[PDB]
Structures are given as structure tokens and as C-alpha cells.
Design a protein around this ligand. Sequence first.
Ligand SMILES: NCCCC[C@@H](N)C(=O)O
Ligand SMILES: NCCCC[C@@H](N)C(=O)O
Lengths: 358, 358
Amino acid sequence: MRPLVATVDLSAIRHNYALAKRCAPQRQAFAVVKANAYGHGAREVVTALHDDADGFAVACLEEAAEVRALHASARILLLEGCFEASEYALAGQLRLDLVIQGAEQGEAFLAAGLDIPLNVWLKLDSGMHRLGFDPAALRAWHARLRSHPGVRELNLISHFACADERNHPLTEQQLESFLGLLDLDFDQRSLANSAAVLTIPAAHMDWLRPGIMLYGSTPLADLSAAELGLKPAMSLGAQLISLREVAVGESVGYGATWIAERPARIGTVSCGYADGYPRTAPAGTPVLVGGRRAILAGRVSMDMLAVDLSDLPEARVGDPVELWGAGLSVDEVARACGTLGYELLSKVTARVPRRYSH
Amino acid sequence: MRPLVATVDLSAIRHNYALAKRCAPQRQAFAVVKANAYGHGAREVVTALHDDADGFAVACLEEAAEVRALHASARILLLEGCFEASEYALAGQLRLDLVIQGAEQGEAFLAAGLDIPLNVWLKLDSGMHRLGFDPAALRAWHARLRSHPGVRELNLISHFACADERNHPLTEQQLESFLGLLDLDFDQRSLANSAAVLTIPAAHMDWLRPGIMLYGSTPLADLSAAELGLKPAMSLGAQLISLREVAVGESVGYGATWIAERPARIGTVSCGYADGYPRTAPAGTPVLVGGRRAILAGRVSMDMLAVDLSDLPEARVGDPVELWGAGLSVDEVARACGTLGYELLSKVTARVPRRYSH
Ligand SMILES: NCCCC[C@@H](N)C(=O)O
Ligand SMILES: NCCCC[C@@H](N)C(=O)O
């Protein structure tokens, strides 16, 4: 088989979830498992956290349906709520926690006429300015929904825009904006993402919403996952499929963007952008070969990648290549590529086989 | 359901394939369908090109097995050959065309001792400098393999590094390298990718290898798919799921990257980087709202994207959003994102449903 495997350490995820829990020991935490549990496998992640998780949060009904099929009783939150009229009936049947974040969505809920009472989370836009109500509108919808027969729990949710930064003004502003609604009778309040879980105890409220940290990728711009005690879940391992000698002045890969200055050893790796790796990953991007540090040379192809092995003379065809995992953080690779671990993990494509360990 | 669908026009692929064949009508053409037919769905693309295609080219044995399952007799080329010794027996069962690029791989084929002779394509490294033999080694391997009992067809293959550019020096070097071997007895010669199929008739040889052009994305740096008469295969459509008023000095999305300079109208779209969209898509990346041109505002998140709707007063929640397709070229969007159509197309993730048009 093509030597490229994503290994998922499930005990790391449980460890990381327990760690998030320890940040607010008397409180509750959603396991955010949207986008196929951030590329790790929603079915397997929900199974590993079946008893551990206070609840689950997802991006859509398709994902919610998948979680419910696996956990018959657990709390499942639709982070974006329902997208259309026909979803409400199914949401009722699967006993989902709903989000109302706009007027259209709120009017759709009212028009649905569901018999079964559900928990409804009203979304405050506290500065992100994408989804959510402004305070006046949320107050209006709190009034219309508090004593509604189909509402079991009326709750409050909002999201930080810059919680990853150690001291961005908007963070404190959002927190104070969230507290501007302390007067309204809410059954639950939720504010904290991974970054907030770890660094803003005042925002913990009732339900934490850790996503990225569960997978051993840092939510913070200034602290690494290793510094935070998070264990990496995904190991994307490949192999050296080719070794070449490249003479001075000769180029490597598309566009002839990499030119040898000295007699060079160039290794080809069984990983490309069709696997999820960034196409535009620059020269100098780290990679591990036989557990040793090396760097990218030349453009990343659809199915192949190239590395400079001029300083690794013992490296041979067949040697294991770690793109990211326990030895090289997905965050380090991501940053060198001008992006975040979020993206690298999310986009590991279907063609990449998944293994699961403990 | 979540309002995000990748609509694939299969008859556009048939059209683009016939256009590739018309570049060299007396010659044959491989339909390059690797990486799930560049995200378009290998099963459906191969079915559409079941009789049209002279043969198929893929990146690995797994992909080849899928193709053989659908077409019992078609020529299937493994572009990178077999990755390990144990693959050869299966490659033999599936009656695949093999590639030999390196000494290790060549030795593995020799050692395999297969039951049936197979077509063998020897790969010349003509300047790409990742895969393939130097001219001397290829001549040596030709001498070994020309009357070897396990070889049915002995062929020559190489691949351009800069055929996307108008007249790059390396393109001539690569062509001269290839031609310098044509004193040797070869059954088939293959050199031309999409770029070369359209612009380098001297590279046409016996078998063309069009990939990207099949899907209506330009392979060339300075001509567009429309100018080349290529019909776009994939249409990625979403919807406005939210619409907001944003005051001057207020920010949008993570990191507060986008700050409103006039009273702004801002819409949220049901597409994000976990769907395959580039996370780092900058401000000014084009989008269509109700068929009308508009630009991105704020960081792309995992499941959501934001657009500036200030100059489209009639835009409403529920309106269709074209991320790319027949209205807006995947090539234009990719150029704005500092990458190519290849990446955007082939990274559309499993959770984006594919619909096929008729
Ligand atoms: N980037 C262009 C797509 C073709 C890349 C080709 N060298 C491969 O990895 O299969
Ligand atoms: N980039 C962080 C991912 C979370 C973003 C969240 N707003 C969403 O799109 O669901």
C-alpha cells in the first residue's frame, strides 16, 4: 500500500478532555467534534469519549445525527442551529440542543411547531460580528422564548474572537459584553473555547467548549501544546520513496523554485496536497526523517513531497517520515505554512487511511 | 441539510477530454483521475469516461483497484509504480501498467517474478529531480528489461517542471533529454501533461497525460480555462446563513483582521476550511452572491466564511453563494489565495456532498 497513514491516539484525546475538565472542575464541558472530529474520525472519537464527555457539540445536523446514533442519551449541541425548516422535526426526534442566532432562524423555530420540548441556546454576537444577536435583539428573543411550551432550557452562548492572543482588548470587551446579560434568566451559559478554557477562568461559565485542545494542538499563539500538557492525537506518517543526488545549479520540483548551491541529497516523500498537506508549504518547513529534523525543498505536489537530506547521509529509501505527530508538532508545521493546526488536521483527506491506538 | 454542495458536470469532463484528444488526434490519451479524480469523484468520472478514454492514470494501487473494478479491460497506469514488494502480485491480478523510477523499485519488480507479463514504463528524470533515472541508468535498465519475460511493453515516461510557463529554459532541456533516448526501442512514449498537451506539440509522443484540463481548470500561467475553451467541471455552492450590520471601526472574525471603514453589511456563508476552502483566503478574494460579484471579509473559519455585502443591498439570508464554478473560475479564486486550482479542487472534503448533473 501507499506508505501514508494517519494514526490517532484515542487515549490522548481522553487525556486532553480530562485536562480541559480540570480547568473548571465543578463545571461541564462539550467535546467539540465538528468536521469529523477535526479530521480524526467522529465515530471513533465519540466512542472513546462515550462515558467521559458531559456532552457533544457539532456544526450541522448530519454530524449531530451521527453522534446521536452512537450516544442515545448524551447532550448534543447544534453550534450553528438549524439551516432550514425541515431540520426542526429531525432535531426534535434526535433530541438536540438548538441554537438561535438570528431573526430568520428564530422565526423558523416558532413556525416549526415542535411538540417535544428542547434546550434552546440564544447566541450573542459579542464582537465576532458573523453569527449571533446584538444585546437588544437577544433580550427580545429571551422574552418570546422564556415561557414557550417547546422550550425546556433557555441558555446563552457566545464566542471569543481573539482569545488565542495573550492580551487583546476585544477579549475583555467580549467578556464584559457577555456579562451585560447576567440579568436574564438563563439555565446555562457558555463562553469558553479551548483558549478561554486554558487562560480565562472568568469565562468558564457553566459549559466549556474545548475543540482544538482535545486533539493536542495549541489554541494559544504564545504557548505550545507541549508547554500546556496536551498530548498530540494525530501522527501523519509517510515514507521516503526516492533518493536522488542533485548537482550544483540543478533545480528541484515545479517552477524550478529550489536550486542546489552544493552537492545535494533530495528525498521524495509519499505525501502531497491531495492528502491535506499545504501545496504552498515553503522551503525550510520542518519534517522528520528517521526521527531526525530535515526541511522541505521544492514545491509540494498532489501526491508527493521533497526534502533536503544533504545533512542526513544515513537516510535511505524506505525510512519513516513524520509530517506531524508526537515528535514534530502540527502547530510548528502549520505556522511555517502561514496557518494553524486547525487546518492541517481538518483537511487530512479521505484517501488517507486511519489507524487507532491506546 | 447543511447548504453546501459540490455539483459536478460529468459531460463537461467528457468535453474537455475530447478537446485534449483533438490536440493530437492520431495519438492516445490517459485520463488522469488520481486523488478521487481531483476531488470530482473517481467512480463517477471513470464511469463517464468508461468508453471515451483510451486509458486511465492513477497515483497508487488503491486508486487503480477502484478503476479496474469499474472497467475490466482498460489500460491503467500506476504513475509512481509500486511502493512495496507485496504490491506486485496485486498489480498483476489487476493487469496494471507499471512504472520503474529507481534502482530499489526496479529490483523489486525483478524479484517479484510475476505470472503474467505487464507493460513497463521507465521513468526518466529530465529536470524535475524527484522521481526517475538519469539517462545512463535508464539505458542500463532498458538493456536489462527489453527482452525480460515479465515485460510486455517497454515504454518511456517523463514529466515537465515548468510547462505552465510560456518558454521556460528547463522545458527545452527536459525535451532534449527525453529525445536523446529515442534511439532506444520503446513501444510507447509519454511526456505531455495538460500544459504540454495544449502548448508543446513536440511533447505529444504516443500517450498524452491530461489531468487538470479535464476538469476545466487552466494548466497555464498566462491563459485562462475560458480562453482555452475548457468547461468547468466543479461548482461549489453554498448559502448566506446570516446577515449583519457592522458599524465603522467594528471588526469581523478571528484576530479582528477586518475592520469596517464605512457602515457595513456583512453576510456569513456555509463554507469553511474544513470543507476544503483555503483558511488564509485574504480580504478581496472573489465570491458570487445571487450571481453577483462580491469579496471576502475576515478570517475564514472551519465551517464558516464571511463576505462584504455592502454594495449588494438586495442580498438576503438563503441566497445562493458560488465559491467557484461556471460563474467564477476556481483559477481566479486560487490565484487570490496564492495557490492553484489543483489544490482547491482536490481538497474538497468528504463531508461536502457531490451531486452529478444530467
Ligand atoms: N501539482 C500538480 C499535480 C501533479 C503533481 C504530481 N507530481 C503528483 O504528485 O502526482
Ligand atoms: N478556525 C477555528 C475554527 C472554529 C470557527 C467557528 N466559528 C466555526 O466555523 O465553526
